Design a binder for this molecule. Structure first.
Ligand code: L3Y
Ligand code: L3Y
Lengths: 232, 9, 232, 9
């Protein structure tokens, strides 16, 4: 579409420049254009897609939380402005989540056969449904939570069959699914269980790793322990 | 608590 | 125009929410809408306008500098992408500067009669022409520098007649004009002179101030000294 | 060097 006239390689190059320039909306737009070329993404390219959209939606989520807090405190009459503006940011956030979900559905997941790509995309699907769940309040909210859960569960089932317990994507998937359980599904015990099991199984596999792999895995393990420290 | 930041390539 | 259907008061309220949410593009858009209502701006409203656009253009300038550095280092053949992307960010930056300049010219400066408002707007005019000068390279570049200079000079002449030497806007004007001399006009001695004189004249007027005014003025004086430390 | 940051109301 919009990036239709730019070469795939040039979109990827510009996405890397946009990251360096901290221009994450541009980065996301370039990576969307790259996906829409129709070819599968390499490991590095998947990471660029993910980083771009995590930064865009992360800023939107942070803004939404600031506005939602002000709106909660309001409820002297301030008028409709706080609600209206929270609604505007919410709608934008939903739109970005729907865009990422649409890239996953058209057609990244269905063409992803290797475990690493498929798990990566299914983790993304769980995450963007989780961000939709954070702002959901209407008839479809349970369905949004269930969609997040289903994506994360399929990713977990593949990861446990096909990846070692220290693989960083398997680890980050478990971490984010544990956050889902704690923050979204009102299942703190499931969150704690999953984080502990994940940590312990990773610990027991560190002996197999190179120095560099060890560093990658232990960094994520420390995020699991940080959540366990907060939760227990 | 914390999800993975995921904000740096 | 775009914010034409929203009440002035609601635009100002939403600009304040957008600042809290760190949504500076939205903040700028709301303040542009408020200016386009046609009424003069209060002190607080002028500050919201300025903060919004300083944050938007500041991010663009930072991105431009990252891209310009990569492009300088390039000049193995990387292809046209770095230049193209620097050009895209440059064009966007120019567009924001032209937008602010257009608000000043239509019609904020001409309706500004008090010294505080007029100096404030003329400082802004100098600043946005300075940002245009930072990226300028063609036939009009000297005219852009001269436009910045002229705006800053008129602001300086009014400020020296109408404001005490500790007034924060007078101080910030002097600081930014000194930066103009140093970075844009290739006049480091003029920069150093102006910063020293400004600092010394402010110091000699601190005795007149309340505790709170003293704090405001000394903060900006320390920025002048920080530049003098770097420059001498 | 440094202009005034001007980024907080
Ligand atoms: C979801 C996720 C897993 C792993 C990484 S990392 C820190 O780059 O290994 C990032 C995101
Ligand atoms: C240009 C300028 C002067 C003074 C201030 S402040 C730090 O808010 O007094 C800001 C910007």
């Amino acid at each position: 579409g919009a990036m239709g006239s730019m070469e795939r390689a040039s979109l990827i190059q510009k996405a890397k420049l946009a990251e360096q320039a901290e221009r994450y909306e541009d980065m996301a737009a370039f990576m969307k254009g790259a996906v829409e070329k129709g070819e599968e993404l390499s490991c590095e390219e998947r990471n660029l897609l993910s980083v771009a959209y995590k930064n865009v939606v992360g800023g939107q989520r942070a803004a939404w939380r600031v506005l939602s807090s002000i709106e909660q405190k309001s409820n002297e009459e301030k008028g409709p402005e706080v609600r209206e503006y929270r609604e505007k940011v919410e709608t934008e956030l939903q739109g970005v989540c729907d865009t990422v979900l649409g890239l996953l559905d058209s057609h990244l997941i269905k063409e992803a056969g290797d475990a690493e790509s498929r798990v990566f995309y299914l983790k993304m699907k769980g995450d963007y449904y989780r961000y939709l769940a954070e702002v959901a309040t209407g008839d479809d909210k349970k369905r949004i939570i269930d969609s997040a859960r289903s994506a994360y569960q399929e990713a977990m089932d593949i990861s446990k069959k096909e990846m070692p317990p220290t693989n960083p994507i398997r680890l980050g998937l478990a971490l984010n699914f544990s956050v889902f359980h704690y923050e979204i599904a009102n299942s703190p015990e499931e969150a704690i269980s999953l984080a502990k099991t994940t940590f312990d199984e990773a610990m027991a596999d560190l002996h197999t790793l190179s120095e560099d792999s060890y560093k990658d895995s232990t960094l994520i393990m420390q995020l699991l322990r940080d959540n366990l420290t907060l939760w227990t | 608590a914390g999800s993975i930041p995921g904000r740096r390539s």
